[PDB]
Write a protein that binds this ligand. Sequence first.
Ligand SMILES: Cn1ncc(N[C@H]2CCNC2)c(Cl)c1=O
Length: 119
Amino acid sequence: TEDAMTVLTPLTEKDYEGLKRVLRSLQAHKMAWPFLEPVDPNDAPDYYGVIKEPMDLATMEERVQRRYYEKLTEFVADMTKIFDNCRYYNPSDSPFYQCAEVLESFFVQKLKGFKASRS
Ligand SMILES: Cn1ncc(N[C@H]2CCNC2)c(Cl)c1=O
């Protein structure tokens, strides 16, 4: 199943080309700009004291380029931190919270396509 594959099956070189495509799709999305680089503390009081595990798309790109991820779960966990951190720090009427909702929905669509392609 795709769930077990996601947790257990090591990422191959072919898998990594798919991860790069997924990442580039997210970076190009109209609602991705809040997530392209780390949050600046001057945009968000106490951000780094509140958020335990910050993440952003440039950090994920570096990690993809360095072959940091061994399993798809780990890549999904980093991506999900981006959206969960945003929704945790901000109120639901924040424009950043709204971007997280839209971009995660897009991620989920692309992720399902990638999982289907591994077979
Ligand atoms: C509270 N807060 N402040 C900023 C931000 N993104 C920044 C990154 C660079 N340009 C916008 C997010 Cl994602 C957030 O949640």
